[PDB]
Amino acid sequence: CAKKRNWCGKNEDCCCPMKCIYAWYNQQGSCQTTITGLFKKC
Numbered sequence: 001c002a003k004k005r006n007w008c009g010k011n012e013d014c015c016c017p018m019k020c021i022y023a024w025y026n027q028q029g030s031c032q033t034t035i036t037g038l039f040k041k042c
Helices: none
Strands: 019-021 030-032
């Protein structure tokens, strides 16, 4: 359970419905309400 701003790296520790996000560099990610951070009813 994390909030958008501090990332998760991967979609393992977020406070849904957020998935971790990416840009280009990779390795890490961001908690963002997308891809499934909307209809991933939690």
